[PDB]
Amino acid sequence: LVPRGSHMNPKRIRALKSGKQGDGPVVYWMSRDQRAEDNWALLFSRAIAKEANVPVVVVFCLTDEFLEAGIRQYEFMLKGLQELEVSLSRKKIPSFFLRGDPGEKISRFVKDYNAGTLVTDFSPLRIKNQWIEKVISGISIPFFEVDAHNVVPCWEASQKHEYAAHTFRPKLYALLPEFLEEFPELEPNSVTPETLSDVLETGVKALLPERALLKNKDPLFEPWHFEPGEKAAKKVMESFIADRLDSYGALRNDPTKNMLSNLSPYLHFGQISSQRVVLEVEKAESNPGSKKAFLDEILIWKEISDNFCYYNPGYDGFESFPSWAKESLNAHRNDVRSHIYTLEEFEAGKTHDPLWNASQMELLSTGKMHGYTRMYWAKKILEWSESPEKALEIAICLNDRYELDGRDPNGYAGIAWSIGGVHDRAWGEREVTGKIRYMSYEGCKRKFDVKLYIEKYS
């Protein structure tokens, strides 16, 4: 229960576990949505706290899986969290950063701090479901989840996997009048109920030996492309609206032009609300076509990615591909590939294709490959791998290791679109790739200045 007129639509919250309510603070276990503003999970947690006459507190687990990615993501996330600490402190909301995996750490915290209710944000990924299962086994209090990432809650937008954007789109757009709304301000707590710097230091030291380096032993990553945190995210949104949105419709598929929003790293960590971005873009007057194209990406393609992962347990495997694509890829399994590269050769941009290599270098150096070349990149991994299963493994590995926005439903769904035709149709049949949409080098040369892209990233 929340207080009458709290402005919380109950369709945004799902019970994970019934239990017996305790009398202490409401705990928001923050995971996907690393921000204080425009956060329905935090807002719901505050509202339940107010109804129960207790404070809200935030807990975040610094998990054991950080070593599976790089310094680039760890520093981006933790610097955001340092700013978040302050934001939450200004609302008199304490934040606790627990070192370890959620099952042990969240269970113990709930007991030690006498928590009344536990609330988390929503992610459809396997690792969050693993964590939920272990937490559920370790607690006796009620446990809810709130979809703070999507404009329309994932379980409301559709009751099933949607095979195409054109089947999901009408369902989603029909629910915007209900779910696309302004956020209430977060009410502070009535009274105030190892530092992150130390953790960051220790974590970086553990990651240092696996840092991406050029032949010179100088690091590849350039950390000045995306300043982390809530405040920076808002400035990137504003600069997008002011300077890039007008040309987005025309230039979104030109990797030589900096005309995308550049919001993905911030959206991935939830340092900015996609609902906020949509409210601001909807209000803007910009060139015809650009708003339509942008909203299709941040509403339809982003939210269909959650739909995909939520409703397909095997979202990172061949089995989740559509029947037509599985049958087609199987028919061409024994076709001889034109090249076969090792993971190391792919990783280091050592293929015979200079466009592919440049795309990989953009990823290595900036942590954000242009959206258009991501499609090209993943499709060539299918073409130059022993099997579609190996291609998935390779693409996922590199995406997750090097993209700031990686380890994300958008990645799994984008890779599945690219390699497996998920959310696509059948195209002309070719050897090796069957009926999976093909993106040729020469097609790219016709579409944009390939030589310039290659010069930029070599």
Ligand X SMILES: Cc1cc2nc3c(=O)[nH]c(=O)nc-3n(C[C@H](O)[C@H](O)[C@H](O)COP(=O)(O)OP(=O)(O)OC[C@H]3O[C@@H](n4cnc5c(N)ncnc54)[C@H](O)[C@@H]3O)c2cc1C
Residues within the annotated binding site for FAD? 248, 261-264, 297, 368, 374, 399, 405, 410
Q: Which sign does the torsion angle of CA 370, 371, 377, 380 carry?
A: negative
What are 276's two structure tokens? 């906020």
User: Does residue 410 interact with ligand X by CB under 6 A?
Assistant: yes
List 123, 189, 264, 312, residue binding ligand X (CB under 6 A) = 264
Stretch that binds ligand X, among 15-23, 47-55, 101-109, 374-382 (CB under 6 A): 374-382
406 binds ligand X (CB under 6 A): yes
Query: Applying CB under 6 A, which of residues 101, 383, 405, 424 lies at the interface with ligand X?
Result: 405
237 makes contact with ligand X (CB under 6 A): no
Please list every residue in the chain followed by a chain break, i.e. its C lies more than 2.5 Å from the next written N: 193
- The span of 73-81, 221-229, 264-272, 431-439 binding ligand X (CB under 6 A) equals 264-272
Note whether 117 binds ligand X by CB under 6 A. no
Cα(291)–Cα(249) distance, rounded to whole angstroms?
8
396 belongs to the binding site for ligand X (CB under 6 A): no
* Residues contributing to the annotated binding site: 248, 261-264, 297, 368, 374, 399, 405, 410
Determine if 418 is a binding residue for ligand X (CB under 6 A).
yes
Comparing CB distances to ligand X, the nearer of 38 and 408 is 408
d(C-alpha 362, C-alpha 381), whole Å = 16
Cβ burial 131-144 (10 Å sphere, 16+ → b, else e): bbebbeebbebbbb
- Of 306, 33, 324, 279, residue with least CA distance to 158: 306
Nearer to ligand X, 102 or 414 (CB): 414
Q: How far is the CB of 261 from ligand X (least distance, A)?
A: 3
- Asked if 297 interacts with ligand X (CB under 6 A), we say yes
By CB under 6 A, residue 439 contacts ligand X? no
Q: Crossing angle of helices 126-138/102-112, nearest 10°?
A: 40
Residue from 144, 155, 269, 301 touching ligand X (CB under 6 A): that is: 301
Residue 152: Cβ-neighbour burial (10 angstroms; 0-12, 13-18, 19+): buried
- Is 73 a residue that touches ligand X (CB under 6 A)? no
Size of the site for ligand X (CB under 6 A): 27
> Considering the complex, what minimum distance in angstroms separates the CB of residue 304 from ligand X?
7
Q: Which is nearer to ligand X, 107 or 158 (CB)?
A: 158
Integer angstrom CA distances of residue 28 from 52, 126, 384, 447: 15, 20, 45, 47
CA–CA dist 177, 155 (Å, integer): 17
Residue of 26, 148, 378, 436 that binds ligand X (CB under 6 A) = 378
Residue from 263, 272, 391, 439 binding ligand X (CB under 6 A): 263
Q: At what angle do helices 409-420 and 323-331 cross, to 10 degrees?
A: 50
Distance between CA atoms of residues 307 and 314, nearest Å: 13
By the rule CB under 6 A, 317 interacts with ligand X: no
Instruction: Map tokens 């400035």 to a residue.
Output: 235
Please name the amino acid found at residue 264.
S
**Integer Cα distance of 223 and 76 in angstroms:** 9
Asked if 268 interacts with ligand X (CB under 6 A), we say yes
Sites of contact with ligand X (CB under 6 A)? 252, 260-264, 267-268, 297-298, 301-302, 305, 371, 374-375, 378, 399, 403, 405-406, 408, 410-411, 414-415, 418
